[PDB]
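Batch manifest line 676
LIGAND: hypoxanthine
JOB: complex structure
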Amino acid sequence: TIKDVAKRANVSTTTVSHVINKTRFVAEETRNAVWAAIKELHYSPSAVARSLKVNHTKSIGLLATSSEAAYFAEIIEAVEKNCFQKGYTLILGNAWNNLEKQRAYLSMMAQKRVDGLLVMCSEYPEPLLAMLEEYRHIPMVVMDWGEAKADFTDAVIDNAFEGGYMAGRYLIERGHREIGVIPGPLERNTGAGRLAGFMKAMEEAMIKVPESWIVQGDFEPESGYRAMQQILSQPHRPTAVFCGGDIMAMGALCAADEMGLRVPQDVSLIGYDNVRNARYFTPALTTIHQPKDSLGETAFNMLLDRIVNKREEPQSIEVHPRLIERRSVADGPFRDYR
Amino acid sequence: TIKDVAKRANVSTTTVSHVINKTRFVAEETRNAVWAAIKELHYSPSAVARSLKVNHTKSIGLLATSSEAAYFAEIIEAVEKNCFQKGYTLILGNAWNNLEKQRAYLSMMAQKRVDGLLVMCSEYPEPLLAMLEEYRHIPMVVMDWGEAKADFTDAVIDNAFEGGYMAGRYLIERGHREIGVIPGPLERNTGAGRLAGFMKAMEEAMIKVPESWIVQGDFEPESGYRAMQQILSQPHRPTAVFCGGDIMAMGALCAADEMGLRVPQDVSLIGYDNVRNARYFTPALTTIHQPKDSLGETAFNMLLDRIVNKREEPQSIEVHPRLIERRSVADGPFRDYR
DNA sequence: AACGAAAATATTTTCGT
DNA sequence: AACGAAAATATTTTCGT
Ligand code: HPA
Ligand code: HPA
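JOB STATUS: finished
ARTIFACT:
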């Protein structure tokens, strides 16, 4: 069809291309004629044909876990922006932590020739780290690891440990000592890593967390609902609680309220993520903020680099969580004593 | 590179293709040899080259508004599923209700030759309905209209009017008569249309809604926060409130609580959407449920049809909202009197 | 019976003059 | 000075025998 435009403008295709891409000088009239034909015929250059020759689709892929979760959704939407303001088109794929699903997507992606790969899989078993190496060619960056798990990728690091620690400290400094904790999957950095940062602070404070007080969650509100229930559904209960993620916390709040508890008069609760609608939780949620836009942009920007400037060496950039004081934490029994 | 595989297997490319696509019979050994070469070379067929010839990218596009909003996020994630379980790859693009942005995406999409187009733009000014016609060729379906706004598309209809009406009725039947309402943008079906369904029920009940009691929102929690504030920040206040969407409602709840109000002992609140985490709102949110998966799948399924079975005529399928009774609405002053 | 030669798909870019 | 001819990119598919 570039033919059809060309013969209607009475010029070569080679010319038609040139005016379209401003790849070289074309006479005014000539350039106008082409436009005219271009308009009449109603022409839309084939991006596929072109990519075939230029060798790049100007389109990147997202091998994600899930897209509904607040945490996720925000990151992605940020990524989309960056892609768009820089020409890239975005292919989104959710693996659901399912190997086959991830193997399939990884393939469709390579075949559809994505220019780069944005990886957010949550849990990375060896089998997965393997598949990834098989694609060490297509440039990529994992955005959800605690450290550099490999050498064939660029990685961005959230410092979820120094966050957990920050969370613990606050509680401590608020006068708390009987603290419980509902963490997210341990096979996750955002789970196991935040937890540990937490426990460190606990140890330096000589605080012990009774195991009847640590309840695993899956980051979904329902899980936090059941964890809170268990923690308070017992003889001795803590005076404060550290929740792995905001959306689980929102589920902790519910149960608390459902059992006549008052947060934070009865129980203080601190979460982690700082989701967009956190402030509108009842009460406004005190939590640890994860820079999600900066995560998105910073990842997209690493990929581009490697992409354009053909970099080959691994790169890892750190990002930092920070505390956000809202209205869900109350002073503790030992506050005055410090 | 299909060449490289072929000459290593000592067979034509034509053969290499055939075994790959099982497009025709190949001898066992021959088929195995090809596989072998295929494996050694580490070959990934070029989906672009192929699409060039077959004329279809086996990939559809989402011209969305935003992707973070709960309402949206859910629909999309549902769409992704359908795409994936049927071979399609998903290109997501958020227009942000920005014409240029929408014009740009619409183009990149046509150029990148999407096989079909899923449209969710929220507000459709004439200028936009126009651009859309310019692409009446590429098969598409709008999923967010109240009726069939045009003839060059398939449409799925939510019946947001019969929902608003349902919402009103409940309140009425609960013993309420002093009701306020924070609706979503009127330029939206989910805004203007739910509102009207509401007001109808109000009229048949001879209830008048004092204008100091109707406050527009933008579907974002913050807006609901300010609307509730205004409604209750006044002399005479209603005994119940109908909120256009759940996430705004969650913002209504906050303010209510912030002003010492008790939902629903003080104010009953009913929303619309039935988002995944609605039940974990404090209190568990009574709302009108919008079948979002069914929306996604049903749209994807219309598109496919038109796609494969080369249909040309418009099609419109209706979907139905339904009431979900939770714990945010209390009996009203006139309950006993009916 | 099982396979190949070559045309085709819609572009870009190299040398031309 | 301003433009074109033709090779190339990585596949599928038509007739062959
Ligand atoms: O895996 C996760 N899911 C949801 N929210 C989260 N916040 C941190 N990690 C996660
Ligand atoms: O446009 C919308 N945005 C967010 N939530 C919604 N629920 C219905 N319509 C909308």
